[PDB]
Amino acid sequence: ISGIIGVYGLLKPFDWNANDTGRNVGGHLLWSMPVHPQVDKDQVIQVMTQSKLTQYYLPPISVVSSLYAYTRGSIKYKFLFGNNPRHNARLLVAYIPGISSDNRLTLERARNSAHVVFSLNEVSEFVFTVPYITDTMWWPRKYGGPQAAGEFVAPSYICMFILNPLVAMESVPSIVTIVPMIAAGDDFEVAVPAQPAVGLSRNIDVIYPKDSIIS
Amino acid sequence: ISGIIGVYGLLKPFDWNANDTGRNVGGHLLWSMPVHPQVDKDQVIQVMTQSKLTQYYLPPISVVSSLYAYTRGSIKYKFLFGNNPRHNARLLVAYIPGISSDNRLTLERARNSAHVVFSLNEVSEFVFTVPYITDTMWWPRKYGGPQAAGEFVAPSYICMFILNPLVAMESVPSIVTIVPMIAAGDDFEVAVPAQPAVGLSRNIDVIYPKDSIISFKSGYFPVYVGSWHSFFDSTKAILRYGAVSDHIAQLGNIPANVNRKAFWIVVGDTIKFKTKLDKINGTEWFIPEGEYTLGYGVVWRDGAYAYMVPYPLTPLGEKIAQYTASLLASNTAISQIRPYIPDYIVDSAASKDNILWSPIEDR
Amino acid sequence: MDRPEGSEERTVQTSNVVLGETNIESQDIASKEYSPTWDRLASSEVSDEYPMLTDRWLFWKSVKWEVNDSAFGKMLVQEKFPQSWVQMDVNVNNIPRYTNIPNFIPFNIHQYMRADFEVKIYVNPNDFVSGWLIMAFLYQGSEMFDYKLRRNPAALMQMPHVLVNVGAANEATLKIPYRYVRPFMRCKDILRGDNLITGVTEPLNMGVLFVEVLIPFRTSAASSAPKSLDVSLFVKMTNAKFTGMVDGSIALLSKPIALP
Amino acid sequence: MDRPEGSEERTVQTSNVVLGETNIESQDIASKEYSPTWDRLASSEVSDEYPMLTDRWLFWKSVKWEVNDSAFGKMLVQEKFPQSWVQMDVNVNNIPRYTNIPNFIPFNIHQYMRADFEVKIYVNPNDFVSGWLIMAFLYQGSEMFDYKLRRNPAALMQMPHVLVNVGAANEATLKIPYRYVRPFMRCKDILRGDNLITGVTEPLNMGVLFVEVLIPFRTSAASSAPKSLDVSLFVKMTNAKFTGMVDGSIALLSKPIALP
Amino acid sequence: DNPPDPTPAKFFVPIPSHSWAHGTNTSEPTNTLRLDGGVVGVGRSDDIGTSDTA
Amino acid sequence: MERTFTPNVMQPTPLLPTTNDGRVTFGEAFNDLKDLARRYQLYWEGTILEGNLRAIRRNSALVQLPLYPHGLRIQPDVNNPIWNIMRDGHIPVISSGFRYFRGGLRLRIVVEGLNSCVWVQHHPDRPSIFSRPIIGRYIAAKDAYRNHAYAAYVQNMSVNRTIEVEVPFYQPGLYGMLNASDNNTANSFDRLRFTGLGDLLIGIEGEQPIPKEGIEISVYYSIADDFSFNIFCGFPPMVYCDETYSAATPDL
Amino acid sequence: RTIEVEVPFYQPGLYGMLNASDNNTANSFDRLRFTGLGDLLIGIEGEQPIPKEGIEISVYYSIADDFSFNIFCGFPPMVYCDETYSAATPDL
């Protein structure tokens, strides 16, 4: 398992526009999501099919975790930036224990939890190995089975804030793409075999219950 | 096993005529076949029986191999020559890896693979232990079970070419017979028990599936072999039900599950008929003029009507029938299928009643 | 640049070919490296080796990717490997031939072949662009029932791959050890079935090599700024073995069937 | 013939080829055998060797000589050696190609080449004929001012040669060590002159191989007695070295100019 | 080699279940619903006392 | 090595102390997918009626079952609730991350409703090129009847209604392909003999009639001890089971 | 419902004949007592009626541990199983 879930998987990329005088400012939230081994569905590359099931490109740590009931340990979040030596910025990425959304989240609060400050000065890759802070030893998986069988919620939140806004020049692209990736830390473990939260995409057909159909 | 498959078995012999100014020349292919432990069926002594199964004289290495699924190793091909100290020649025998037929095979290519050169100078026996050259470790048997269950193809080819043509003298036989024999090399092995590809010949009876049987429509039998004008100006043989013209026997309903490249074999009673076929260019295919029993047939379609073309019950007749069915399958020119059809000589006897046919297909 | 000469360029030599590099690479290995043992059980004929011919770094394709055709997951390369490379010399009718390239000259006279491979990807951008490539390999991928679904860059990130940061202009090497269902691959179209049998196999299709866009190629808006960038590939063989000697024309090469 | 098998046939193996002989040979060596040392001074590129390909006994021509065309000095073979042998695979237009014969496949990708040669001559007559052949070799003979005069069998008896007694049916081997004006021969038509210069050289013309009638082929007067006899040749290379790697089509092969 | 084994069969008495009454001083065969097929028991520490059923 | 490449690490806290893959808290360890693949799952299940078999049932086969480590291609329909909402088991999910394999499989055939005898054969040299089973009267004669010399097991339902067999690896090559396509014409040879362990045939041996409810055959399978998932390529994209039947109707 | 027995070799001679003919009058003694292991009889012991479908008896057999195939003479000619039901109708 450790050799499988150690392999990085790609998450939904996003653009970071230096010319956006509205968004590219100090304190702005660029990217955020709950922290758990299965990634949130909306942070993963998707393919939808009319009348069929959605295909999700889950990372190895996400696939393996969907086979087991419990999980625990640190998670490596690798961030890849599409920049060149002209671009510069500073980001503050934080791990907020016991929070599932950004409803009360600001930079000036995020600095009051475990966090790191990254400088984009001629650097394109860095890893933020986030901690595991829980009131218990194993944490139940988020996505379970049909009809949300055995499902639960994530224990913590990761958030990326703009400390020093992105700067570019006139002879250089003003957009810097950011590609988040995820892998298991060396301290990661998986407890208990359960109904897979996932199925293959060889056949994405599904028969919805006739009793629920309306027209 | 090693003590069994080490024993040589005899293969189909052939004549080597020193006076044949056409064939007995440098570069001529005398003998060739795919290399695999079971021998090709047409390279083995046979006995055919009307309405029954063919008996094959398989060598020990062939019998044992039909009990197992996989096989590998070198094969010893012993060649025995019926000569005396007057005869002389030189042969080039080659092992061509990854080739199953002689379609692109020439002496000047065969020399570019593993090969040996034998001199027939006061020598009557020699062995060509051929290699095992494969892209994998075990090789699936060629012949398997009923309905070609689990069958496959051979991996390589062996070919005998004339380097220096056979010479004899006037006080000495001009024909030298060659008897090929086969045994397993010391490095030969057999992997995995499977349904025997073979059965004993104590009882050669067989009940062909009733669902595949076809025949002539009522009133369109008894039938006889004859001619009619709209088919190569009545020079070729077809089955008629009368002497008035356009009275060509029609076949009943032919099921759609029958392969398009399949020819047919007579099951019940049959007839004898006199036919012939002249040697076809680029082959050793010819039928001398004689009386033969009707054993095989090929279906000739003309619109909503289906007619049957007769073939002799002979191993060569089986091959020509199959080849013809294949030509009809690819919509080959009617003029180019003509040389593969038996000729019309004279009307033959009629059948007692209807004639029943069963679908078959060869490699 | 601080010297009369620009600076020191690293060098890599093999046979009679010398490759120069200037930056730190991105590397990966498709599978565990090993020395083969069961290939000897496949052919009794002695396996010939031509290291000066095969161990040679050879130049593959150049592929040109522009700003206007650079989207996330755009496939700059999708090729059967090593088939596409070994068969890169075609005639007027797009029929391959192993007769002109010294590295491929053993493929013409042998029926079965095996080797480990290495692939280098060279991009030479200026100092003022940004983008990212991913070169990945999938063992016998085209035969998988979900092959087209594995084409997404999110899926490529999980198979053996290397990355090229256009902002850093790094070189990259991907090692690909031989792994196949058989201890040998076929050099040509041989042993197809007959009337009843269908044993059909593609020559040299050990897998699929991808080169895709991780982050789209971006440029200054200025007119005289290059909106294009060439991507060049190099390939070589490590343990090239050939067996089953045949005439160069005993078997033919077909027009190669492409990927979707 | 005193056994069930005829008798014992001697065997000679090289690479994956096995030749059988039954009689005592006639042998000779064109010149003193040696190990080359000055070839290393000709090319700084490492000389490749392909023993499993080149050390292979290969079949050459068969030539048919009859009673009615067998006179003293009749030339069954007059060929530039090894040119005629290496270039024996021609197309529709009699243009040679090094691409199909595994022994010659190194000639296609190399510019310069060198080796020692051995030639076997096989005749398989019956017990009741009489005649004699002489196979001889002349180093770069075609360039000599009296070449045509050296064609007479009386002159062949003085150059390195072997004899075939049709009355004994013996095999025969002629060894031909490499000797040339240069430490390498050319594989193709290269470096011809220009407007002013004329440096023109034939590929692989180390000399001339003769096969001539020493004593005319005679037969019984009977009708069904063979009035014909085939003469077959085999060739192989001892110390084959190749240098100057090039694309197989950088240089072309011309239609070969024949001897008088 | 395929030697015959003519060792006499033993008389055995079939019963549907193991003891219902026994609660101490005996083993109990059972089908454990685990991935580990050995003698397995839940983990412990000082955080979790021993049974206080004395 | 890029797949595990982690540059410029920024780690605010130390690592989390181990539990030995669950061995500290629960009594067992969970560190290898191979262990989970050795826990049986459903391979195929169906009901057979007299109408599905040949008119004259001469001890003919009931099911022709292709053997794939990655399982069959599932068909989710109203008659198959499991495949519809549970989808593919753990083993097909595990298998999807690997290209090759080289071992055997362990099966368990459960036959209910039949008082007759069941025969089971393994045809290693005859594996199917389709990822779906063949039933009853649609099975060709070559397979519909007991073949000789094949490894087999014959079991009376009167003694036990569950059959336990282990199917061996009898393939001519190095690897067997995982996750193989049914649409394969360029590499028929690979798909034919380098993919499946060979068909498993389950038949009936007796004259007893089948009840009007029919008989039910349930085949479970798992990985054998000599089995290995060999070369890790990517995982394919997945579907989520909670997106079959919604929680909008929490009980249904 | 399955019976397992091993039948012993109780013959007065050195060998038992393999592949023996049923048409044998010149050597009746060989065919009678030097060919077969002796008949095996399978019967019923009870008053229970046989169902209208009847009972089915299937006898499987194999070689015992003390068995030997002894003198290798030739193989007889064979028939091919793929020549019973043709592949012309690949499914039937």
Side-chain angles (χ1 to χ4, degrees), chain B residues 107-238:
Chain B
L107 163 63
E108 323 181 315
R109 283 176 177 169
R111 66 184 171 185
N112 297 327
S113 297
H115 70 265
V116 298
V117 175
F118 169 71
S119 183
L120 189 70
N121 176 47
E122 297 170 350
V123 182
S124 298
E125 297 188 62
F126 86 100
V127 180
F128 178 21
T129 300
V130 298
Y132 174 90
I133 308 175
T134 303
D135 62 335
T136 186
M137 332 163 54
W138 292 98
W139 193 260
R141 61 181 184 177
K142 182 172 179 180
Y143 303 123
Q147 304 177 313
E151 300 207 326
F152 198 61
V153 296
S156 304
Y157 207 73
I158 183 176
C159 52
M160 176 184 283
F161 284 100
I162 299 171
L163 210 66
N164 284 344
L166 177 66
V167 290
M169 65 155 304
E170 67 258 38
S171 305
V172 142
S174 63
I175 298 176
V176 168
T177 304
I178 298 179
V179 180
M181 294 181 257
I182 182 178
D186 288 40
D187 59 350
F188 201 87
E189 295 177 315
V190 280
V192 171
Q195 158 65 44
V198 298
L200 300 184
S201 51
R202 183 185 191 183
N203 192 342
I204 62 180
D205 294 352
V206 57
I207 295 301
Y208 300 107
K210 61 171 185 177
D211 285 27
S212 297
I213 298 294
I214 70 168
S215 55
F216 299 108
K217 298 185 174 183
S218 54
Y220 291 91
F221 60 100
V223 298
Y224 67 86
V225 186
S227 65
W228 83 306
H229 54 284
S230 300
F231 191 79
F232 302 113
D233 303 320
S234 65
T235 195
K236 297 296 179 176
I238 317 183

Side-chain angles (χ1 to χ4, degrees), chain B residues 5-41:
Chain B
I5 58 179
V7 180
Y8 283 96
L10 178 143
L11 297 189
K12 193 184 75 172
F14 61 96
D15 292 325
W16 181 189
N17 181 19
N19 288 334
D20 193 321
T21 59
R23 298 183 180 76
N24 178 32
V25 300
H28 179 79
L29 182 66
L30 279 178
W31 170 91
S32 66
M33 55 179 219
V35 182
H36 67 293
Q38 311 161 307
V39 189
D40 267 3
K41 294 179 181 178

Side-chain angles (χ1 to χ4, degrees), chain A residues 1 8 41 53 56 72 78 125 127 138 147 151 187 189-191 197-203 205 207, chain F residues 3 5-6 8 10 16-19 21 25 30-31 74 84 87-88 131 237-239 241-243 245:
Chain A
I1 291 184
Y8 283 96
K41 294 179 181 178
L53 302 135
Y56 298 85
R72 68 173 219 127
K78 178 162 60 174
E125 297 188 62
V127 180
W138 292 98
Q147 304 177 313
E151 300 207 326
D187 59 350
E189 295 177 315
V190 280
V198 298
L200 300 184
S201 51
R202 183 185 191 183
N203 192 342
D205 294 352
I207 295 301
Chain F
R3 270 174 295 172
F5 184 55
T6 116
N8 294 314
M10 299 183 82
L16 183 70
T18 179
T19 63
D21 310 310
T25 58
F30 306 85
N31 44 42
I74 63 169
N84 189 43
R87 290 275 142 54
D88 317 275
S131 302
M238 305 285 179
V239 294
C241 293
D242 60 23
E243 275 173 33
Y245 278 22

Side-chain angles (χ1 to χ4, degrees), chain C residues 37-58:
Chain C
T37 173
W38 276 11
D39 56 321
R40 298 178 174 282
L41 307 179
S43 172
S44 65
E45 196 185 67
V46 186
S47 296
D48 293 340
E49 308 188 11
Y50 313 97
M52 294 299 282
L53 296 184
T54 61
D55 213 319
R56 210 170 80 102
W57 272 118
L58 189 59

